[PDB]
Nucleic acid binder design. Sequence first.
RNA 1: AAUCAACACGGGGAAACUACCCAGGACCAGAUGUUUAUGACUGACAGGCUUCGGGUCUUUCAGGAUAUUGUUUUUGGUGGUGCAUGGCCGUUGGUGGUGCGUGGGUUGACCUGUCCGUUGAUUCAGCUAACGAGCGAGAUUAUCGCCAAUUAUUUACUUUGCCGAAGUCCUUCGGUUAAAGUUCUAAUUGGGACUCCCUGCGUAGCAGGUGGAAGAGGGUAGCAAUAACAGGUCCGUGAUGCCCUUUAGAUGCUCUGGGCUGCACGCGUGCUACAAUGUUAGGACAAUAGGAGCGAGCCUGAGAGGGUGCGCUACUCUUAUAAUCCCUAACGUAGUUGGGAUUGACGUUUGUAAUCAGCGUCAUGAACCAGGAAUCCCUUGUAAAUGUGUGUCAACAACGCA
Lengths: 208, 90, 97, 52
Amino acid sequence: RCTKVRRIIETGLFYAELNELLTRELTKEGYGGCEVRQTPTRTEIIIKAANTKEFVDNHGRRLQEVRMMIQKRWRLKEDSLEIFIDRIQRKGLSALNQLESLRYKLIARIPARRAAYSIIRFVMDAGARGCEVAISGKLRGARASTSKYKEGYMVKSGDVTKQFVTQAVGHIPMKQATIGIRVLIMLAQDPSGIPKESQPDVIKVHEA
Amino acid sequence: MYMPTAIRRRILRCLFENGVLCVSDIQSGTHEELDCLNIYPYQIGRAFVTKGFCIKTYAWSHAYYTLTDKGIEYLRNYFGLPANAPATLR
Amino acid sequence: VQKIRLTITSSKLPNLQRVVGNLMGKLKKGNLEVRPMPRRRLRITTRRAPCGNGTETYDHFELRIYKRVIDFQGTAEAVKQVTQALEPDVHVEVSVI
Amino acid sequence: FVPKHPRDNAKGSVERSCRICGKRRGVIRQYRLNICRRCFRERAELLGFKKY
RNA sequence: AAUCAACACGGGGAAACUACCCAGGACCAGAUGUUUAUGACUGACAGGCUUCGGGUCUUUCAGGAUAUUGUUUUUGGUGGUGCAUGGCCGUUGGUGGUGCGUGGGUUGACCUGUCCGUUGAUUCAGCUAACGAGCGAGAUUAUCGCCAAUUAUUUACUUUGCCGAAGUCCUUCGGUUAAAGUUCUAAUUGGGACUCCCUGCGUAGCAGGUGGAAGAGGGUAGCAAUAACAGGUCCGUGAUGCCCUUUAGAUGCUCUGGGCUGCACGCGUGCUACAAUGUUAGGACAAUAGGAGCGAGCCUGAGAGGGUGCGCUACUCUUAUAAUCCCUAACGUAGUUGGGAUUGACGUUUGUAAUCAGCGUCAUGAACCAGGAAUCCCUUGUAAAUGUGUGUCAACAACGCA
């Protein structure tokens, strides 16, 4: 029994706590966001990740570690909570997933050239119009210094940034200093795929 | 830490029954499910981790203690229960 | 028979307009007779710099609340079927009058 | 533990902290958010707030 | 934190907590690697010590392995370094800029591409050893202004009809699930403006004009490239490297009290005035917010305040008949009914606390006669005046955002 204001804000505040939680559990499984369906008595949540097998191994024990962690937190009733999972088609173009691949490497002491041009090639071959990778902080010297590695083309301004550009910021702690990882990935519009409409820059004239 | 004895059991039963206990990061905070100060489940939780009976994940000022393989074998030794013997059901 | 109100609420307008189409669509099938409320801008105006340094610049964060009200005469049998859309960030309060 | 000075209507009550932050330097109480501003603005788009 | 880019900035309006600082007194969050069921450790009545005490102490009951002693080092820290760093933000500069593929020029740094008119604009036009792809600009997003479709007789109104009250032959009020709607109200989908039109000037475009709700980016915002500043922040963070602190008479945490409000003085942002285009007294239209806290109506008291708590999970009920202005009086050029600082007392609310909080009442009745040299902001619903919400908030705005 809430106001029309608070049912939006509670559901917003639910989602943001829930999403910061499933950063820290599902680092190995390869997290790629979620969606929450809210009902007065029923809650349905789609988790999305790359390694869908890694849940279902040990006859689905890994999901029931998560499902109790949600249930006990907000004190929801079982049956009234209804988690699924659904797989990521094209892991190449999701930003949170490809951040984790660049995180995986730079712990294990690959050069930053080779770590970026691993993923920046993997993004473009999978299917995307451009991508940028930044590795900010302290390699080699006492001063910190910024790498930026770019290909394709990458739109930075307007509304059209928000629709097209996926992006994901993070950080790696180390023995020496705190690096920052940062991967922007631009998409192509599909004809009603999974954006719909083209950019407001482009127009197309018909053939006679 | 000095715990009282009766509160100690019904935490480690709430740990054993569920598998995941949540507690507020903030100390001196009343606790739901089992009523007590939120120092009590929190400080025993990091004791288990050192021995290695559970995993600690922390998000938004909330501490989650997910109970691993060894602690399931330990708490059958503690409570005196037959195997199989929580929330790993399918 | 207890003339029932829906009250449909959302953050986002495309996600709302699916649910209004369905809940207007289903009153075509059941044949129940079918009868926009003003939207709120929850403006929160934080100073965008963390420290006290620099020129005092302020980001404005409007959360928007679109709100529609369908209502109709309906016999409890027919209404159970209509209620059951399921969209992200939409709510539907049912209200008997 | 259990700090004995009352803190009913007080700045350092445990409700009043940034929930994420655990600190109270610059708190947004309106619409019952109870979130610190630096803490807010990192994760405002997740909550459904937007620039216009 | 110190020119712009520190100085109503850290949303920093600190009575406690916040809090880092100072004076006392407790607590162990002493994790994990020899003592003890014959009590390891733990809790307390009354009365002493004492700010106040199961901190201690004279008594002597209540619990029950959660241990003790030594050794290891966890964890905690608003401790140090922003000249070790992440992120975020301000700024150079929101100016018009920035640099790749192949080709050419040069031994080479490097250049060319990226150059006589036009635009807010590397905006277009055209020259042309360069041709072709980018990013920023533009487009797009949001709102304000004008339209008519789509809905609305229990969340907005209007017209007509009914039943009231006055007027008392037709005027004005209040009510109505009662019939028709949409001009006001609310908000979704579309339409609308393009230098299209005409005349001058010079193809790109420019100036004026007609019409038009709107005319030259329709107004205002939002978003905003590459390249850097040892500018800011380790006092936002479970962002963090290293240093030291944990010798517990702690830099951990917490209780009582006090500070950050201390004043010979110097600067920054503000407020109220110096009056008569005024003040005093009496009489007579807003918008945007917020609210399971707002608080209806009716009683009580000069006043502040107090009691009773109707509606509302809100276009429905509520904060809520705003204030300059307007119209009748009073005053009379005076440090004056201008001005309302500083002080004495009484009446109160909020709070564990009023000792430095706000409101009321009666008294007290200051400096100020328009401000030197200097400097700031501003082009249309703008400046200036004039109030109202909101953020912080138990209580307190001369401040910020609207």
